Structure formats: C-alpha cells, structure tokens
C-alpha cells in the first residue's frame, strides 16, 4: 500500500522520521504533493517507490516554455535518481475539466516524458494526471461509466498518450463523500467494506462494495475513449477519523482504512486479475487545512502516535 504525505500542519515530524516511520510500519510507497527538497533528500536508499507531483504553479511553464521540463526534471528526478525510487510523475490534481490550467496538462505530459525517455526512465517513471471523480456523467451501475463531455475533450487525447506509453490514469477515489451525498441511499456498511453480499448486480459484475464501484465506472469510461488497457491507480482514497457527522469517527476510519488494505490485492470486478495500486489520503492529521473533516484524514497525530492501529 501507499500513503500520501501531506505536509499541511505547522507541527509535524521532519521528513527523514516520516520516511523512517514509513519504513518501519512498511509501507511501500508515497504520494508527494511537491518536489518538497527535505523530503526527496529523505527518501535517498528508503527503497520507497514515489508518486510526485507537479505543482499548480509550474503546469504552465512547463507547457509552454521549451527548457522548463527538462529543467524541472533535472532539478527534480535526476538529481536524486537512483537513490529515490520514483514511480510516477503525476501532472496537475483535479484540475480537469474546471480549471484554467487544464489546457496545459497533456502539453506539459508531453514535455515531462520526452525529458524522462532521454535519460532512459520513461518506463520505470510513468508520466499521468490526477483527476477527481467529477469527471464521470453516468455512474449507476458502473458498467455505464462514461465521462463528460467536458472532460472528454481533455481526457480522450490524454489517454491516448497513456495507452501509446503503457502509463495509468491517478484518480483520487473516496467512497466517503458519496455516502455523505447520498443518505438513505448509499447505506454505511457499502462504503466502508462491511456490505452484506452484492449491492449492485451489473450483468456478469457483483459489486459488494463502493470502492469498487466508483473505480469500476471510471474503467468503463476509459474503454469508450482508447483506454481499455489504461490501469487505474488509486492517487487518494480515506475517510476523517473527526470533524464531521457522527461517522466521522476514529472506528470508522479504521475500518475503512483497514479494510482498503485488505481489499486491493484482488482487483476490481472489472479488473481483477491484478492488485489496485492505492495511496491511503493520509499520513498525518494536517491542523493547517479547512476547519473539520480535512484536519483529520490522518492515519497518525503530529507526535507520530496512530489515530488509530493500522497493519500496513
């Protein structure tokens, strides 16, 4: 499994006792948000397999300006290759279809992997974007998963691109937030695992649980636009352990959290044949996001205590 390593609160262990408890408690891969330069230094011989992305900020530049992506890459990946076990470079988060940087994106993917395949890491360090799951229209059964048409207008060319170089889409997934949706609907135990037998029934595909479904739908989209053979990964996917509804709870983000890990290795119904790569969103409690639930994805408070026991 992977964790995300967000870095958001003004009290939290430097990075090299991050990676030393990664490390310790097994974990085999990381999400970072940002080239964070402690943090990359850190990682040096940790044998961690990396997910990094781009900022916000540099998606532009490294579009449209020639030297940027190979300057960025340098700086960024060379630099401290091989020591650091990079994975992916991942191009923008959330960004598509809504945001004025979406235009930028396959460009700047473009510009990243031609960098990469000069100095021969364009297969271990796959280049993809993160996207929201705002990017389906029809997701009820998951068989009729298809992407807007706003979105495929963006993705139908990106996925082109991750076809022709063997890459997957990132998809930040979390069941959480469609059952706070829907209440009455979306039932509890559907979302964190705990269903009894099959929820949704979709022709050949039994659907037991949310995770599955929500990944499920964006496979089902991505064969209607050139990418049947695109894998998806996990990029986030948790649940607040407080500062919501009553289940936002630290038994509930355990169970879920818990159950995640134990789940993935089987694949999807769709995808079975293969374990779902997956970043649990979070390591740490970060107390400098939103007031609520987004101080509280945390898998261990700032003094490195468990929220609540997880087996990695």
Same mark, same amino acid.
């Given at each position: 499994?992977?964790?995300?390593?967000?870095?958001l609160?003004?009290?939290?262990?430097?990075?090299?006792?991050?990676?030393?408890?990664?490390?310790?408690?097994?974990?085999?891969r990381?999400?970072?948000?940002?080239?964070?330069?402690?943090?990359?230094?850190?990682?040096?011989?940790?044998?961690?397999?990396?997910?990094?992305?781009?900022?916000?900020?540099?998606?532009?530049?490294?579009?449209?300006?020639?030297?940027?992506?190979?300057?960025?890459?340098?700086?960024?990946?060379?630099?401290?290759?091989?020591?650091?076990?990079?994975?992916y470079?991942?191009?923008?988060?959330?960004?598509?279809?809504?945001?004025?940087?979406?235009?930028?994106?396959?460009?700047?993917?473009?510009?990243?992997?031609n960098?990469?395949?000069?100095?021969?890491?364009?297969?271990?360090?796959?280049?993809?974007?993160?996207?929201?799951?705002?990017?389906?229209?029809?997701?009820?059964?998951?068989?009729?998963?298809?992407?807007?048409?706003?979105?495929?207008?963006?993705?139908?060319?990106?996925?082109?691109?991750l076809?022709?170089?063997?890459?997957?889409?990132?998809?930040?997934?979390?069941?959480?937030?469609?059952? %706070?949706?829907?209440?009455?609907?979306?039932?509890?135990?559907?979302?964190?695992?705990?269903?009894?037998?099959?929820?949704?029934?979709?022709?050949?595909?039994?659907?037991?649980?949310?995770?599955?479904?929500?990944?499920?739908?964006?496979?089902?989209?991505?064969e209607?636009?050139?990418?049947?053979?695109?894998?998806?990964?996990?990029?986030?996917?948790?649940?607040?352990?407080?500062?919501?509804?009553?289940?936002?709870?630290?038994?509930?983000?355990? %169970?879920?959290?818990?159950?995640?890990?134990?789940?993935v290795?089987?694949?999807?119904?769709?995808?079975?044949?293969?374990?779902?790569?997956?970043?649990?969103?979070?390591?740490?409690?970060?107390?400098?996001?939103?007031?609520?639930?987004?101080?509280?994805?945390?898998?261990?408070?700032?003094?490195?205590?468990?929220?609540?026991?997880?087996?990695?």
């Open positions: 499994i992977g964790v995300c390593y967000g870095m609160g003004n009290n939290l262990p430097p990075p090299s006792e991050v990676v030393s408890l990664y490390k310790s408690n097994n974990i085999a990381m999400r970072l948000y940002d080239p964070n330069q402690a943090a990359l230094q850190a990682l040096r011989n940790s044998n961690i397999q990396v997910l990094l992305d781009v900022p916000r900020s540099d998606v532009q530049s490294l579009a449209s300006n020639p030297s940027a992506a190979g300057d960025w890459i340098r700086r960024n990946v060379v630099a401290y290759w091989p020591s650091v076990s990079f994975r470079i991942a191009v923008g988060n959330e960004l598509i279809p809504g945001s004025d940087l979406a235009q930028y994106i396959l460009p700047a993917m473009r510009n990243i992997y960098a990469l395949s000069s100095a021969g890491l364009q297969n271990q360090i796959k280049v993809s974007t993160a996207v929201d799951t705002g990017v389906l229209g029809t997701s009820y059964p998951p068989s009729a998963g298809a992407f807007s048409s706003a979105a495929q207008a963006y993705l139908s060319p990106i996925v082109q691109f076809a022709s170089n063997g890459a997957p889409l990132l998809v930040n997934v979390y069941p959480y937030f469609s059952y %706070t949706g829907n209440p009455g609907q979306i039932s509890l135990p559907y979302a964190l695992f705990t269903a009894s037998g099959v929820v949704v029934q979709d022709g050949r595909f039994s659907y037991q649980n949310l995770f599955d479904a929500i990944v499920d739908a964006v496979f089902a989209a991505l209607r636009v050139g990418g049947a053979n695109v894998a998806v990964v996990v990029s986030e996917s948790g649940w607040p352990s407080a500062g919501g509804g009553a289940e936002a709870s630290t038994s509930n983000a355990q %169970t879920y959290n818990q159950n995640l890990i134990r789940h290795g089987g694949g999807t119904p769709r995808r079975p044949g293969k374990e779902i790569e997956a970043y649990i969103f979070e390591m740490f409690n970060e107390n400098q996001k939103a007031g609520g639930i987004e101080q509280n994805f945390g898998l261990f408070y700032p003094n490195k205590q468990p929220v609540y026991q997880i087996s990695f």
